[PDB]
Design a protein around this nucleic acid. Structure first.
Ligand SMILES: [Mg+2]
Ligand SMILES: [Mg+2]
Ligand SMILES: [Mg+2]
Ligand SMILES: [Mg+2]
Ligand SMILES: [Mg+2]
Ligand SMILES: [Mg+2]
Length: 51
RNA sequence: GGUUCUCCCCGAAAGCUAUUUAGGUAGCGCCUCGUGAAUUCAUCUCCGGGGGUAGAGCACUGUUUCGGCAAGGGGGUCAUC
């Protein structure tokens, strides 16, 4: 139970650190986000087909 | 901007790379927990190594002063077929 006092060890930040995306309500990047670059599953080419 | 009870153990980073990126983020580095593994790792002594820095030097690349020797160049006087 985060954010329930000093003694709990997870107070005043809820384990989210300081003012990042993870600290915002509903914040955080989508799956595969590489900081702005096209992710590895897009740098590499498609191959094959499903039989 | 704010995030509410307690105790115990360990304990960071503000770096690299990349980004319509530079008060954001991802991977790695660093932290924690768990599971494995070797006289694995660290320090010292001895031994075996590649350096080319500090310093020094002026053969080389350049730079710099003085002296000697001295072509050559410039100026003047004659002559300038
Ligand atoms: Mg804490
Ligand atoms: Mg805050
Ligand atoms: Mg954060
Ligand atoms: Mg401690
Ligand atoms: Mg910003
Ligand atoms: Mg030196």
């Amino acid at each position: 139970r985060l954010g329930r006092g000093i003694g709990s060890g997870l107070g005043k930040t809820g384990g989210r650190g300081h003012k990042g995306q993870k600290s915002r309500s509903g914040g955080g990047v989508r799956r595969g986000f590489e900081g702005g670059q096209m992710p590895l599953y897009r740098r590499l080419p498609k191959f094959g087909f499903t039989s």
